[PDB]
Every structure is written in C-alpha cells, then in structure tokens.
C-alpha cells in the first residue's frame, strides 16, 4: 500500500554471481541500517564460484557494495592418523544470510568435507558450513555442526544411522531473540531432515582457527527418525522461530518439511528440545507445502500467526482444474496452546507457474493501522512472467484476501524478482518499515520505501436552512431575500511523519444529482454549485475549518423542489503527480455525501 | 411494452441487443413513439417496423469440415478421422449461448508408439536382465492391437551432481559402485538410447548393451527424463498419426521441482529439448527438476499417455500422482519387472477405455458445458469424460458455449480435443455485437441540428451538448429540452401550461 514503486534503489553485484539470493538488514552499533546481500556464485580467488557476501550501506541511489571478506581457501589438517579436508569450491557462500545484533551469519550449504584415513575415507559430502562475522570488529568464526570423522564403512554397518554427512547445514538459518542460531539441514540423517542450534556467543568463543573438526559444548541437534513419513522429507528446508505454547521463557521453532510423507509436505512447530507440539499437513501432493514459512501476528491479538507457502500448488480453475499457481496458508493461533486447525485464509496465486508463496516476509505494521502486514512474492508471476511481490494487510479477522499493492519486476525476464524478501525494518528512518526484494537472476536488489499514510477526516457542516420558505438571507448583487445557508467545511489529516507541505484539494459539490444547468443551490461568491479549495493541512494538526456562503433559488424557480438536495465533499491529493511522485498515500473517507432535501 | 428490452433505455442499436438475446432493434425510419425500437422481435413486428430492415442477429453453429469418423485406422493414417465435426463456425451475440456436438471414436488398428523410459539405477540391475527380449515379445502381443508399432528406449538415474552422485575417491566417478567390488556406468541424468523404430529387433540389441549406475538418495530424477522424452519429438521419434505411450518404469520415489536446490540448482525447468547429438540430457546439472504442472502441460501438448510401471512399494505414491496428470495410468511392476509386457498391454487397454475431452485456447469470456453420452444412451450431464469404454466405441459430448458480455476482438478460436489424440475440433467464434446499420455509419447530418449528431440506425446518437430526439438541445436536454417542444410552436406555453420542459418532451 505504501511501498513507493517509482523511487527504487538498485544495489548491483557482479554479473553472474546471483547477488540477491539471500538478503537481510544489518544494524551497526551506531544504529545505521545496512543490507547484507548473499551472492552464492561470486568468483573466488582461483576463478571458482565459491560465493560471497556484500554489506550494502544504505544510500538513496544505491549501486555497488563492498564485499564482506571471508576465508575462501580449502583447508587440510592432519590430526592423528586422519586427514580432515574442506572443499569450498561451489560452496554457495551467501545462500543464506541472517543478521543478529552485531553478528552477520552467512551460510554455505554446499561446502564439501572428507576425512581420509589411510585407504578408507568418510566420502566428500556437502556437510554444509556457516561463517559468522562481526564486521565492526573483524571477528570471524565458523559453525559446521555436521562435520564428522566417522569413516563410510561404519555408516554402512549402522544402516546409515546418524548420517549427518549430507546435512547441507545453513540451507535455512534463523537466530532467536536470545541469540541462538538455528541452522536448517534438510539433507541431515540421510536426507531425512536435520536442525542444529547453538548460541552465537558460544560459537565465537569455541571457534579455533586451523581446527577443522570441533564440538560446541552447548549445541543441540534434532533426532533421527525411523518413521517412513519423514524419509526424504527435507525437514529443515525453511526454519522460523516464534511463540506458540504460552510462556515466553521458551522459544518455539517452525520447520518446513516440503516433501514430508511422500511429497505431501508439512510444517511442524517444536520447542527448544525439538519435541513436536503441532504438525500442519500439506493440502496437495507435490505442492511443496513448507517451502517458505513466516511467523507474525497479523490479526493483532498478541499471539503469533503462522504463514506457510506452497509455491507449486495447483488450483482447480474449472477450465483446466490443475493450474500451477501457488498458495499461501494462514493459521491464526487460537486461545488454547495446542489448538491450531484448518487454515484461516488461502491466498492463491493467479499467474501460471508464478510460484506464488516462494517467499513470505513479515512487513510489520506497514501502514501503521494497528495490524501487522505481510508480503508474498511470485518470482515468475505477473502478466509478463517477470516477477511480482504482493502486499497483504492485516485486519481484525486475519489478512485481506485482496493485495493492497502489487510490485512488478523492474528487471528483465528470468530475474526471479521476489526470490528473497525482507521487511519490518525502517532503512531510511521515516517511521514506516520498508522492504528489500532480491532478484539473483539479474544480480540486483531493489529497495522499496514506505511513504507516509495520511488518514483523511472529512466533516462538512451545513446549516439546516434547506427550506426555502424563510426568504430572509439576501444576495450581494441583488437583495432578493432567500433562505440561504452557510457551508462550513472542515478537513483533518492524521498520520505519523506527515509532511508539512501536504496541501489537499477539497472538491465541494452542491445538488450533485441535478445537472449544472439545473443546479438549485449556488454560492454567493461565484454562483457555481461546488468549488475546489487547496487547503494546506500539512504541518497543522488542527482540522482546518472554513465556512462558505451559498444561496438557493426562488420557490418558483425549482419546479422540482420535492427533489432532495445532494451536497458532496471530495478531498484528494493535489495534482502534482507529474511534478513529483506522491509523497503520501491518502487513506480513509476521501469522499463524503452530505445528502439533504427541501422541506418548505 | 413488457420485458426488460423496452424498459432498459433505447440509446442505439448497440445497447439494446447487448442486453439479452430476445431483444430486437429497428433501424429504419418509422413511428417516432410506440415501440422503443428495442422490444422483442414479435412486438417490433407487431408495430410493422420491418421493411426488410429489422435487425435481430441470431446465434448459429454451422459446421465447416465434417469428414465422417473412420472405422479402422490400419491404412492411410493421415486420413484417419477420430473426431467429427473437425471444424465449426460459431456465432454468438452478447450474453447468448449456442450448443454443438462432437463425436469421438477410437479406431481399432491405430498405430502405437511405445517409448520405454527405464530407471537404470542399481536396484534395477535385475530388471535390465528381464528386458533383453522385451522387444520381440512386445511386437507379438501388440500385433493383435495394431498393425504399425514403433518402440524406443531411454534411461535415467538422476542428476550427476552431489549429493546425488558419489564424488570420492576419483575412481568412484568412473565407477560409482567401486566399493561393492563391481563395475557400473558413470552417473547420467537421461540418455536417449533408441529412436522409435518399427524394427523391434533393435530394441533387443540396444537393451543388452545398457548398464546400471549408482546414485545416493532414494528419489530418482525421473521427471527430468519424462520432460525430455516428451519435448524432444525429433529426437525420440514420435509420430503424429499414432498413439503415444510413455512407459515410465521405476522402483523408487521421484524428484520434483525445487528439489534441485539441494544440489545448488535453482534455475527452473523451461520445458525445452536439451538432448544433444550425444543423446544425453546436457542441462541435467544446470536446470531444476520439472514440476507436476509443467510436466502435465507438455504431456497434453505433445499428446502423450504416460504409464507408471512402478513397484508395489511406491504404487500408492504414483497412483496419487496419476490423479493429478490426465491420461495417465499406474501398473504394479514386479521387483525384476518380469510382467512389464503384460503391464503395457493392460495399460494400453486401460488408457483407451476412457475418453476425456480437453479444451485449449479458450477465451476468458467463454464458458463451456459438456453433457457426456457414453455407451448405451446415458446422457450424464456436467461430465467432459466418459469411462468404461473399449476400442472402437463412439462417444458423443454435447457442448454449450456461453459468452459473458461481448469481447471486442470479435474473432476468436479455440479447440476441443480428446486427451492423447492429435485429432481435434477447431471452433471459430465470431461474436456479433453490431448491427448492419452501423456499416452505413452516418455522421452528423442535417437531421441532427444541421450536422450536430450521427444519424445511425434511426436514433440520432450525438454529443452531450445537442441531445434530444433531433440532437439539437445544445444544452442539457432536460430543462431546455431539445427544441422547446414543451411549448408547441407559439401561443401555447409548456403544452398550454400542462406539460413543462422535462425529460426532453412537451
Ligand atoms: C495417497 O493419498 C491418500 C489420500 O487420498 C493417502 O491416504 C490417506 O492418508 C491419510 C494419512 O496420511 C489418512 O488419514 C487418516 O485416516 C483415518 C481414517 O479415516 C483417520 O482416522 C485419521 O484421522 C486420518 O484422517 C487417510 O484416511 C488416507 N485415505 C485413504 C483413502 O486411505 C495415501 O496415503 C496417499 N499415498 C501416498 C502418499 O503414497
Ligand atoms: C445438458 O443437459 C441439461 C439438462 O437436459 C440441459 O439443460 C436443460 O435444457 C432443457 C432444454 O433446453 C431446459 O428445458 C426448458 O426449461 C425451461 C425452464 O428453464 C422450460 O420453460 C422449458 O419448457 C424447458 O423445459 C432445461 O431448463 C435445462 N435445465 C437447466 C438446469 O438449465 C443443458 O442445456 C445441457 N447442456 C448441453 C451442453 O446441451
Ligand atoms: C552473458 C553475460 O553475463 N553478460 C553480461 C552482460 O549482460 C553485462 O552487461 C556485462 C556487464 O558487466 O557483463 C556480462
Ligand atoms: C463526484 C466526486 O467528487 N467524485 C470523487 C472524485 O472527484 C475524486 O477524484 C475521486 C477520488 O479522489 O473520488 C470520487
Ligand atoms: C522466566 O524467567 C524469569 C527470570 O527472571 C522468571 O522470573 C520467570 O518466572 C520465568 N517465567 C516462567 C518460568 O514461566
Ligand atoms: C441444443 O439443445 C436442444 C435441447 O436439447 C436441442 O434440441 C438442440 O438440437 C441442441 N443444439 C445443438 C447444436 O446441439
Ligand atoms: Ca514458548
Ligand atoms: Ca494472532
Ligand atoms: Ca498494517
Ligand atoms: Ca522507511
Ligand atoms: Ca529390481
Ligand atoms: Ca537419487
Ligand atoms: Mg533405485
């Protein structure tokens, strides 16, 4: 609703680097907000697509960004008889970037690792690794919870029990408020799905450079399961945190398993000990229910609500009956702790193969109406199939079924505009949260700024002299005593950070149903039913008032006296759209109908 | 007089026919009052307003190409007709619906194209041994069902990329099954082995030179193979005048779209042909798996009936996939695929036992209704598919095309086609929302304030200034009327002080 689509800031990374795959807001100690953008295909020192992370300072014009340097060299340490090895080529450094406090966590889910021991080996498998970094102090640390020195032979004898070799940890990352980094490892436990959590403070204090295999003493990992429903479930594709069980001393994790129970998909909510509290089964097979998850309180009841994306959901159009559009499921948390049930809203995409629901970003209170808002993206949606981001506003009963705004891709086709979304952070400090959209196909990131919202207040006070029988008030040109009445109009503009230059135009209307020739009521200044006034409400908290003088014709003049007199007041922003973009969004009763009638 | 035709205004001929089909318009110069020149046809005729000038378009559905249904498809496959009529001309006036019929018959000796898409994973090493003589045995069994059979072979394991493929030590790339002390082939995404050929002995020769590979995860990249076998017509060798059977044999799960992110692949499948001159899927490591919707679209586009020849452990999974993909059936494959020959014959009979209609390029303002009529005379309404048929049956589907409002293109065409068949009914829609009087298109003439309004279809359509019967108001038309007709000539004020100047009349 507020996101300005004309004044866009374009941050560009190197070409063919997928700059914009993952993005997040970073706040310095000074409070300045910067954008950390993941570019998981940035060329390394040896012309290999290792990966990279860019820390973009906030500028109105945007442009190139400095690169947050990480260690991109393969490591080999001989500890005991074994030989630990890390392979960072094509590791995708930047496929998941999350910022907490002064720490930026950039993950490389596809970093390989092997343990050579004489002839035997542990197999070069994408264990996955995440690089933690403090840009203001230069402290670098790593967190690879799925590295192990167990040789392959042992896994075969154990039927691949606790096989964390294919974890791809960092696929999805999130940091809780207390500071616990929760990494998602969909390939853990032989592609069953894994979740690893460790405090950020303990990762930094335990990381020793040069040591490739180490254990963080305070970390905790999920449990392997023998239930066939979990097999190949990719449990950890998307991870989110929130409060879903009452007391706030414990945080709850929301894990997306898009292929749970034979590609059905599921989203499970668990406590800090990975004990499942509630599971939300998918609706359609191969719909990828759980590809994206988001936790935010949309209906403003104080209780977090869960949003699940199913980008490949196929709807029944009654003409094709299977159209791959995508769907987003909204679950409102009830009074009871374990009471989540059927989805409260089903937001379905409209463009074929648009992958609606591929990214859900809680925007906070975008319009500051008292209810939080979300933004769903279709990376290949829109009429031209170039990408769309749809903004949905919260309300008392959930979300609006209808998007309040649609953001079209400013980038060419195939840019995947909307693959990465991030909001609820005021990057320009204008009082309204903004949104950053990542298009890794074009290697660019678009920043959408939320302009202020003005709540209009129209009150037209008209004297009840609508009867013409008084015949007392006179006209300036000719006495002609007629029952004229004064027209006192007041307009009020309310809203946070409203500019002082706001000059609304109030369009008065008298006897609107009657034509201009048949206007029964006219002013005493111009004798024209209705007028336009450019009131300058900007900078004035008071509901600026002003009275005007209007007169009615004689009794015999209007043979259709019985007809009611329709008075209308319409207010709208000034026609300055060509000169500059609309600095505000007028919201509320723009037009009011003060309908009266002639009695005497 | 009665009916909305009279009550809903007059304006021009465009407005009154656009209300409801029954409404008629008189364009010739006749009684100024009486009929609002917008009533029904018989009311307008009652007022004698038709000097062969009554305008009343009627929705019609006339056929253009109506070759009769063929009885046997053995000879002259280019002249085998399975749908009649083949092309009709449909005229629809606004908010009107016309019904038409389409007979679909599946001929007996129609050519069959069977492409064997085999999962060459390690668990199907024994399956490859039971296929060595499938080509000879398939020709004998298909002999009684067709006189022109073509068979081909293709293989798939998965995307040759970690974590799907073992990458260590270097000897595990040229022999992925080194550690069970065996020799395998390097992992491949999809290799096209044999082009569809009638010489069934080539199938036996080409299938005994195949070898299995070894991947790591349970799911296999099979939907990638289905996409490439579907969209590579010139490579696989599909025939336009033949039934297209895609036998998809596997024993494990399948990778779907967005599962390629595990290997670092995010680029969606574009549905193009990426098989090169080396008969290998060259974009297997750079492009994501296809989704169900994209895979379904290409199957319908290429008229391919997909057969799931899956083992018992995944029969329920692929039975649920088949419910989302029209024209597909699932058979229970053996652990060594020893009954795949009987599976193909049963699936072909099962596939041909159901006729399902499919509409393409349908305008967004058109709504279709199908009343299926299967064997005997069961007119089951609301159904566009008949089930329980056999080879040689002749089903019929009454279709009703209704148009919301009136599209401005006035010329659209859509096609109604049975699933898996090239033959289709081409419907040409010709919307009729204008009259013959508008062809004259009379500009501002002397009858409308001496050149202040168009005299088309009798009623003078004219700008907001000059309104009224004779487009001469020059003001609003209500208080000033059009020609102060309220005051008859002179000496008579507002109709002798009875009717004032209102509604542009005395
Ligand atoms: C293919 O799809 C079918 C559904 O169309 C799957 O079967 C269904 O599986 C669910 C559990 O995942 C069953 O739900 C349970 O049913 C019992 C009995 O009604 C009920 O008491 C439980 O509360 C729960 O709802 C469901 O009944 C079952 N449907 C049928 C018809 O058996 C099937 O598993 C899928 N096959 C796959 C994914 O391979
Ligand atoms: C599919 O079959 C249905 C049912 O036969 C068709 O609709 C029905 O068509 C009949 C014949 O036009 C309609 O009959 C007439 O109904 C009016 C009242 O609505 C009555 O005054 C007439 O005397 C006559 O009985 C019938 O109403 C209608 N039913 C409905 C619910 O619309 C339908 O047209 C067929 N579709 C196709 C594609 O042929
Ligand atoms: C194939 C490819 O990557 N082409 C790009 C080109 O589009 C871009 O304008 C240029 C600027 O660096 O870099 C290169
Ligand atoms: C009769 C009248 O005033 N209609 C108003 C129009 O003037 C205004 O432009 C629009 C939106 O501002 O809302 C309506
Ligand atoms: C949460 O922890 C605080 C620590 O100050 C404690 O006072 C409070 O009682 C705790 N709430 C619980 C355990 O529900
Ligand atoms: C339309 O339906 C009516 C009533 O069943 C039938 O008489 C008529 O022949 C049908 N028209 C076509 C073209 O099917
Ligand atoms: Ca809690
Ligand atoms: Ca809530
Ligand atoms: Ca809001
Ligand atoms: Ca802002
Ligand atoms: Ca087997
Ligand atoms: Ca596999
Ligand atoms: Mg297998």
UniProtKB/Swiss-Prot annotation, chain A:
Tissue: Isoform 1 and isoform 2 are expressed in platelets and megakaryocytes, but not in reticulocytes. Not detected in Jurkat, nor in U937 cell lines. Isoform 3 is expressed in prostate adenocarcinoma, as well as in several erythroleukemia, prostate adenocarcinoma and melanoma cell lines, including PC-3, DU-145, HEL, WM983A, WM983B and WM35. Not detected in platelets, nor in normal prostate (at protein level).
Keywords: Calcium, Cell adhesion, Cleavage on pair of basic residues, Disease variant, Disulfide bond, Glycoprotein, Integrin, Membrane, Metal-binding, Pyrrolidone carboxylic acid, Receptor, Repeat, Signal, Transmembrane, Transmembrane helix
Effect of residue 183 to P: In GT1; disrupts the structural conformation and the ligand binding properties of the heterodimeric complex; in addition the mutation appears to confer susceptibility to proteolysis
Domain of life the protein comes from: Eukaryota
Effect of residue 191 to L: In GT1; uncertain significance
Binding-site residues, Ca(2+) 4: 426, 428, 430, 432, 434
GO cellular component terms attached to this protein's record: blood microparticle; cell surface; external side of plasma membrane; extracellular exosome; focal adhesion; integrin alphaIIb-beta3 complex; integrin complex; plasma membrane
Record membrane topology: Single-pass type I membrane protein
Places the protein is found: Membrane
Side Extracellular, residues: 1-600
Sequence positions that bind Ca(2+) 2: 297, 299, 301, 303, 305
Binding-site list for Ca(2+) 3: 365, 367, 369, 371, 373
FG-GAP repeats: from-to residues: 4-65, 79-142, 156-207, 220-274, 275-340, 342-401, 404-465
Cystine pairs: 56-65, 107-130, 146-167, 473-484, 490-545
Residues carrying sugar: 15, 249, 570
Residue sites binding Ca(2+) 1 per the record: 243, 245, 247, 250, 252
Gene Ontology biological-process entries: angiogenesis; cell adhesion mediated by integrin; cell-cell adhesion; cell-matrix adhesion; integrin-mediated signaling pathway; positive regulation of leukocyte migration
Annotated function: Integrin alpha-IIb/beta-3 is a receptor for fibronectin, fibrinogen, plasminogen, prothrombin, thrombospondin and vitronectin. It recognizes the sequence R-G-D in a wide array of ligands. It recognizes the sequence H-H-L-G-G-G-A-K-Q-A-G-D-V in fibrinogen gamma chain. Following activation integrin alpha-IIb/beta-3 brings about platelet/platelet interaction through binding of soluble fibrinogen. This step leads to rapid platelet aggregation which physically plugs ruptured endothelial cell surface.
Subunit structure of this chain's protein: Heterodimer of an alpha and a beta subunit. The alpha subunit is composed of a heavy and a light chain linked by a disulfide bond. Alpha-IIb associates with beta-3. Directly interacts with RNF181. Interacts (via C-terminus cytoplasmic tail region) with CIB1; the interaction is direct and calcium-dependent. Interacts (via C-terminus cytoplasmic tail region) with CIB2, CIB3 and CIB4; the interactions are stabilized/increased in a calcium and magnesium-dependent manner.
Family per similarity comment: Belongs to the integrin alpha chain family.
Protein name (Swiss-Prot/TrEMBL): Integrin alpha-IIb
Curated annotation (Swiss-Prot), chain B:
Reported impact of residue 221 to D: In GT2; uncertain significance; severe type 1 phenotype; the mutation prevents normal ITGA2B/ITGB3 complex expression on the cell surface; the mutation may interfere with correct folding of the protein
Segments on the Extracellular side according to the record's topology features: 1-506
Outcome of substituting residue 253 to M: In GT2; uncertain significance; severe type 1 phenotype; the mutation prevents normal ITGA2B/ITGB3 complex expression on the cell surface; the mutation interupts the interaction of the ITGA2B/ITGB3 complex
Keywords: Calcium, Cell adhesion, Cell junction, Cell membrane, Cell projection, Disease variant, Disulfide bond, EGF-like domain, Glycoprotein, Host cell receptor for virus entry, Host-virus interaction, Integrin, Magnesium, Membrane, Metal-binding, Phosphoprotein, Postsynaptic cell membrane, Receptor, Repeat, Signal, Synapse, Transmembrane, Transmembrane helix
Presence of keyword Signal: yes
Subunit structure, as described in the record: Heterodimer of an alpha and a beta subunit. Beta-3 (ITGB3) associates with either alpha-IIb (ITGA2B) or alpha-V (ITGAV). Isoform Beta-3C interacts with FLNB. Interacts with COMP. Interacts with PDIA6 following platelet stimulation. Interacts with SYK; upon activation by ITGB3 promotes platelet adhesion. Interacts with MYO10. Interacts with DAB2. Interacts with FERMT2. Interacts with EMP2; regulates the levels of the heterodimer ITGA5:ITGB3 integrin expression on the plasma membrane. Integrin ITGAV:ITGB3 interacts with FBLN5 (via N-terminus). ITGAV:ITGB3 interacts with CCN3. (Microbial infection) Integrin ITGAV:ITGB3 interacts with herpes virus 8/HHV-8 glycoprotein B.
Swiss-Prot/TrEMBL domain comment: The VWFA domain (or beta I domain) contains three cation-binding sites: the ligand-associated metal ion-binding site (LIMBS or SyMBS), the metal ion-dependent adhesion site (MIDAS), and the adjacent MIDAS site (ADMIDAS). This domain is also part of the ligand-binding site.
Record's protein name: Integrin beta-3
Organism per entry: Homo sapiens (Human)
Underlying gene: ITGB3
Residues of the full protein shown: 27 to 532 of 788
